[PDB]
Amino acid sequence: YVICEECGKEFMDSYLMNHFDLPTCDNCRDADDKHKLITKTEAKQEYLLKDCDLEKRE
What residues form the annotated binding site?
4, 7, 25, 28
Q: Footprint of Zn ion on residues 6-45 (CB under 5 A)?
A: 6-7, 25, 28
Residues found near DNA in the complex (CB under 7 A): 39-42
First-to-final CA distance of the chain? 24
Query: CB-wise, 23 or 47, nearer to Zn ion?
Result: 23
How many CB atoms are closer than 10 A to CB 24? 22
Query: CB-wise, 8 or 46, nearer to Zn ion?
Result: 8
Coil, helix or strand at residue 35: coil
Query: In whole angstroms, what is the distance from residue 58 CA to residue 9 CA?
Result: 28
Q: Which residues bind Zn ion (CB under 5 A)?
A: 4, 6-7, 25, 28
